Amino acid sequence: FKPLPISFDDFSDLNRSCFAPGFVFGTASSAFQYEGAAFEDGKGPSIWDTFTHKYPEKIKDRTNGDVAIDEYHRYKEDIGIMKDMNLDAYRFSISWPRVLPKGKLSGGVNREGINYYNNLINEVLANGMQPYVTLFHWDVPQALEDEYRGFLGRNIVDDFRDYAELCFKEFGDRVKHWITLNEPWGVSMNAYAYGTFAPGRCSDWLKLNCTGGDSGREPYLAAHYQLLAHAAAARLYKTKYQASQNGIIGITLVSHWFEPASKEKADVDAAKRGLDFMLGWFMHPLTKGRYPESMRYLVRKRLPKFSTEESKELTGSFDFLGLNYYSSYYAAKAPRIPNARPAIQTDSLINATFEHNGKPLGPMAASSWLCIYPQGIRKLLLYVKNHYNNPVIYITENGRNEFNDPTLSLQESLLDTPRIDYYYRHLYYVLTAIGDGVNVKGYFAWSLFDNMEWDSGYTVRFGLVFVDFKNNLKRHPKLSAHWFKSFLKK
Amino acid sequence: FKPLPISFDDFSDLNRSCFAPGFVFGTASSAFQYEGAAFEDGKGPSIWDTFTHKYPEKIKDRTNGDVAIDEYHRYKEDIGIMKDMNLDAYRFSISWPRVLPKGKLSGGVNREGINYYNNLINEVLANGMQPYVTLFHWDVPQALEDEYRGFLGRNIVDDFRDYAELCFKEFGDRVKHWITLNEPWGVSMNAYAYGTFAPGRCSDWLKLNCTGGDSGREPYLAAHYQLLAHAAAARLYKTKYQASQNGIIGITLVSHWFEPASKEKADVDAAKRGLDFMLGWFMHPLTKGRYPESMRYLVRKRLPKFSTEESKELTGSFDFLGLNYYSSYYAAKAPRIPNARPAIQTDSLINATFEHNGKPLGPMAASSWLCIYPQGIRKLLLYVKNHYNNPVIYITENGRNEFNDPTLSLQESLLDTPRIDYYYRHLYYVLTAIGDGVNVKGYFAWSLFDNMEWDSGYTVRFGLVFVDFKNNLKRHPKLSAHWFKSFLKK
């Protein structure tokens, strides 16, 4: 580490002029969290649609995404806010079942679905911003879940290649930045290892009230098919559409920073395994066509294998890496319990905590897994540069939350100084990583507006802009929106 | 609650123009934490001097206050920083054993000791600031501890009246704001109930490695004599010095906000008892000449009694209240354990926590008792106004800390955005209390510089200005110092 020649003599010294003139600043979202219109204009149901209405008790506040923040009908006002804030880009996702209601290409193409994304894309570009588009953001068409168990069936790869091709042909003339998948670790672990996400599967002996499953086998299956789906969509783009469209394609991975519990070799080795089982799971295959050695050694037979052809297709199939960072953990070696039933969470032999002898690594945000350690982003960034031959990186999500509290007045709800604290220190550490040679090209805040946080429902708020859910979903910019607008003003 | 007509459209909208033009903004400190020169220019030893060298294992990092930040020799530079920052006042304490080395007036007056405070007082006033002086800030002369057990002996009252008179005669011509005691709750509980502060006493059965004591009796004795000492000094000032000196005298009390765990009557009643045993302990006697009913009912015989004359002297003996606020707790009723040995901590029958069904009240700072809940200051302020007939209030301490971390570079150490967050929201809530009729006249931040935090040693940092303890105690203003200077600039 070696500091930055700045001199933070005023609070206003940290702004966009500190970054290269070409650095991209934007905000991110997903279709299920923002759009609304779940049954409208020919859209078919996703697994998240089904999960929330079938099992309301699996959602903290027993809510759903039928209306969400209604971006479907409010997109002009939303883009208007972005333009006023001086943003450079917008990262959003396309709903698979909105364009192809039955999943398969032979089920029919929803023309009205295609029209919505054309309107959104043209609005983004007309307001001096560039669209960064995510193909899959956890909303598997219900038809494919019913037919072959969605991402647990090999059938998903061919159907996902067809979906990607439809988006490339229809929107490819305007969209020059594509993202195939959004956080395959999250899907694998929360949908198949813990059971908190749709379809809510996990091993029965864990007593997490799951809908069937196996946490020692299914998470690995879901991750393997997700990687094959990515390779299919990425190879199609490069071989048939990249020479005429002139854009780039990548993938978004999520990772935490794992800090050794002590200086001991066992604790040093545990942190490394944490990174291998979270980040390495997806980056090894993407750069080398095989899983990390530690996963191969400790999972043995339960870890799927790539064919020769699958390895060739995967190796190097990305123009950039989309990195998502939020939290950090302390990692210590966990001893092998004799006769333990297999599960992905215990397979790595790590004890992950937020303290070392009762002393905290940092304070917590409203989500119980999010520990604030700004140094983690810089250390994660240097790990990617040094272990994965210095790829081009875009930070595709970064942020924190607060609790939804009905006793607070509007004025009180808009004074989000902890979020300002969070962005200031994380942005400082991104700048130090750039100083040390990391190829970071952009940064996207999660999120512009308050929204549904998956299984947590509307009990937490992640936005820069407050949404009044009791009065026609009114948009009320928080103090952090005004602060970010000033940061971006020259 | 009803908001403030402001409109926090920019971050710079919260400044000193939001407060009345006469509102006082300053910073606070104590003699043991800042001065240094512990054995120099005729000063005698305090109980804190003795405690740290005798028992280095009772201090987290095994440190002492011999040098501290050396304000004794560096006071001109320290006042210089304050003047550059646009502050209105400085709250500091006078060391009892520096002016009277043997405690008693018949032990001799240290002339050199008197000269230091004359130099400091004249420097404060010459730099356009007013001194707010604390007579006792936990540094009991060792001579009086040796002779009659300091604040556990009735002999302390007469000696404390003599000390106060010396300060009034010598410094009274320039000092118009006097504070008799600093946090008698802290002394009573930490020195006699838990054993963490000098002289480190507590009940042997608690297994806290104390130096002797009784937690069911001594804390009550120490608090009773502290109140008698205050009354003696306050009555002397008003009857003999106030008509010619034209100043005012008060006392500084510390209190947390106690939030009911649930809506249940038992939880509502537990929060009230929390306030009675912490704040009420000292405010009841000061306004009514008797302890709160709940303390009288649950402590019975172990609670000392005031004579008729002592009640008359105490009732109304303060011109203003010095209030110290830092943290908030959730309070729930605790059941009576059959056969429990008596202790002040269990006497109130309350279970105090920082969570309700695992959900946090707020995040924690570096000190394990400090939970961040900005609403607490406003609720505490309204409680004082409504229960204690609307006194004149000065907030004499408010702030947060971070850990001393040797792996961080200087630049990294100066980016104290969490402290900015802490002052912004607490200052907003002070403004709302003023709006609802509380008579708040000033606010003092704890503290300007990093210093020794009693039994925690130098493991935590509370300042707006970083002190480099490895390089001639160099002063390096943090981002929060620059932010506070801008807040105070018009």
Curated annotation (Swiss-Prot), chains A, B:
Catalytic activities: Hydrolysis of terminal, non-reducing beta-D-glucosyl residues with release of beta-D-glucose
Record-listed a beta-D-glucoside binding positions: 33, 137, 182-183, 326, 397
A biological process term (GO) from this entry: carbohydrate metabolic process
Keyword terms: Disulfide bond, Glycoprotein, Glycosidase, Hydrolase, Signal
Any one Gene Ontology molecular-function term assigned to this protein's record: beta-glucosidase activity
EC number in record: 3.2.1.21
Active site per UniProt: 183 (proton donor), 397 (nucleophile)
Disulphides: 202-210
Family matches, as Pfam families: Glyco_hydro_1
Enzyme class label: hydrolase
Tissue spec: Leaves.
Classification via InterPro entries: Glyco_hydro_1 (IPR001360), Glyco_hydro_1_N_CS (IPR033132), Glycoside_hydrolase_SF (IPR017853)
Coiled coil: none
Glycosylation sites: 209, 401
Glycoprotein among keywords: yes
The keyword Hydrolase appears for this protein: yes
Function of the molecule: Hydrolyzes cyanoglucosides, contributing to the release of hydrocyanic acid, which functions as a defense mechanism against small predators, when the leaf tissue is damaged.
Complex formation: Homodimer.
Family: Belongs to the glycosyl hydrolase 1 family.
Protein name stated in the entry: Cyanogenic beta-glucosidase
Lineage: Eukaryota, Viridiplantae, Streptophyta, Embryophyta, Tracheophyta
Gene field: LI
